[PDB]
Structure formats: C-alpha cells, structure tokens
C-alpha cells in the first residue's frame, strides 16, 4: 500500500502489447493516450488522428512559410513528440527546414512534399527533365 | 542515494517467472538506465520501451520525473520484436 503504479504500468503494457499485435508501435498508442486520453487508442488512431495530423500540417505550414507539409512528416513529428501538438509542429517545420537545407540544389519544395519528406526519394525524383 | 527499482520484463509473448530488481539513482536519466540494462542484462536500448505508471518513458527525463521515489517502486521494460 499503495503501489497502483504497478496497475497503471500493467494497463499501459496491455495497450502496448495489443497495439504491437495490430501493427501499432508503442509511440502511436502512447501518443493517442496523451493527446485526448481515449480509452481505446486503436480506434482513435484510425478515427480521430487524421484531422489532428492535418492540424499539425496546417499550423506547421502557416508558421514558417514557405519552408506544404506531407501527412507523413506531420505524423513523424507527432510521434517523435509523444503527442505534444506544439512540439510536434515545431519539430515538423524544424525537420523540414533541415531537409530543404540538406539538398544539394533546388529551392525543389515540391519534391519534398511529393515524397513525404524523403530526402533521397525527392532527390531521385527531382533529377528529371 | 540508490533505490531498488522493481523491473518487470514484458514482451510480445508474456502472460511472471522473470522479475528483476535494479539499484538506480532517481536523479539518473532513463537513458542511463537503458545503458545499465544494456551492459547488465544484454538488451540493446533501441528495443527498450520503459513504462512507469501511466507513462511510456522518454530517455531524456529522470526516473524521478515519473517518478522513482522509494525503493521497490515498480517499472516495466517492454522489449520490441526486432
């Protein structure tokens, strides 16, 4: 008395195992719980998350234009920040700035958007005429 | 000073035969614990997911942040299926 800590731990481990069995990584389950604590995070990912990633993308694009964001970049920032929307947007625009800076020649922007922030997929596709 | 942390190892396959106790400083970071479990128990930190209470731990924070206070405080180490 009283280590309900172990109860909460077992609960999260349960949801993490269930997520892993459905292809969801623990960061997805935990990010779902931390951003509006849905009692089912598996339903929440498919159900409520798309508009939230769209939110990260809209705020991120509005913050430091022009450097549009892809859904994959917003998702990666969102998961990398365990669901913290402001941190997610900041890391999103920060990582995209890193990716346009990383390119050898361009500035171009369409290539990174079109290939979900993949530096070398946008690099290989933008080598065209 | 050091405290007895009650790590319960959890895996994709698991029901409680394997428990572990680790002396850790609450002021030490979760990353430091990850390196400790790497050398001690042989688990690479890339596969380690620490759960303390209702939190999937971030390696930058201290165990006290979640938080490790008394001895015997329970933690869970979920290992990923590489």
Give DSSP secondary structure letters for B4-51.
EEEEEEE-SS-----EEEEEE-TTSBHHHHHHHHHHHH---GGGEEEE
Q: Is B53 in contact with A5 (Cβ distance < 8 A)? A: yes
Alpha carbon A92 to chain centroid, angstroms: 8
Residue in the structure block whose two tokens are 């990383």: A102
Q: Are B63 and B24 in contact (CB under 8 A)?
A: yes
Q: Which of A5, A11, A30 sits opposite B73 (nearest CB)?
A: A5
Method: X-ray
A70 Rama sector, left if φ>0, alpha if ψ -120 to 50, beta otherwise: beta
A16 touches chain B (CB under 8 A): yes
Helix, strand, coil % (nearest 5) of chain A? Answer: 70, 0, 30
Give the span between the Cα atoms of A48 and B38, in whole angstroms. 37
Q: A66 pairs with which residues across the strands? A: none
Alpha-carbon gap: B7 to the closest alpha carbon of chain A (Å):
10
Resolution, expressed in angstroms to one decimal: 3.0
Alpha carbon A104 to chain centroid, angstroms: 26
How far CA A1 is from CA of A21, A64, B63, in Å, comes to 33, 51, 21
Q: Is A8 in contact with B53 (Cβ distance < 8 A)? A: yes
**Chain A residues with CB inside 8 Å of B66's CB?**
none
Domain annotation for chain B: domains and CATH numbers: 1-82 (3.10.20.90)
Give the span between the Cα atoms of A104 and B25, in whole angstroms. 46
Give the span between the Cα atoms of A68 and A112, in whole angstroms. 9
Give the span between the Cα atoms of A32 and A28, in whole angstroms. 6
| DSSP summary character for residue A115 | T
Give the span between the Cα atoms of A26 and A116, in whole angstroms. 22
Alpha-carbon gap: B24 to the closest alpha carbon of chain A (Å):
17
Q: Is A6 in contact with B81 (Cβ distance < 8 A)? A: no
Pick the CATH number of A49-129 from 3.40.50.720, 1.10.8.10, 1.20.140.10, 3.40.50.1110: 1.10.8.10
């Amino acid at each position: 008395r009283q280590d309900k800590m172990r109860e909460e731990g077992l609960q999260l481990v349960s949801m993490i195992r269930e997520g892993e069995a459905a292809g969801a990584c623990p960061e997805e389950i935990f990010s779902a719980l931390q951003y509006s604590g849905t009692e089912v995070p598996l339903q929440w990912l498919r159900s409520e998350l798309p508009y939230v990633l769209e939110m990260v993308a809209e705020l991120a694009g509005q913050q430091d234009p022009g450097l549009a964001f892809s859904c994959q970049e917003a998702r990666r920032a969102w998961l990398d920040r365990h669901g913290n929307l402001d941190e997610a947007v900041e890391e999103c625009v920060r990582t995209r700035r890193r990716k346009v800076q990383e390119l050898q020649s361009l500035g171009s922007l369409q290539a990174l958007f079109q290939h979900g922030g993949d530096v070398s997929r946008a690099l290989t596709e933008l080598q065209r005429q | 000073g050091p405290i007895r942390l009650q790590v319960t190892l959890e895996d994709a396959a698991s029901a409680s035969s394997a428990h572990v106790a680790l002396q850790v400083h609450p002021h030490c970071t979760v990353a430091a614990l990850q390196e400790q479990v790497f050398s001690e128990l042989g688990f690479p930190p890339a596969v380690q997911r620490w759960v303390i209470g209702r939190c999937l731990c971030v390696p930058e924070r201290s165990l006290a942040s979640y938080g490790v206070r008394q001895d015997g405080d329970p933690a869970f180490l979920y290992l990923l299926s590489a």
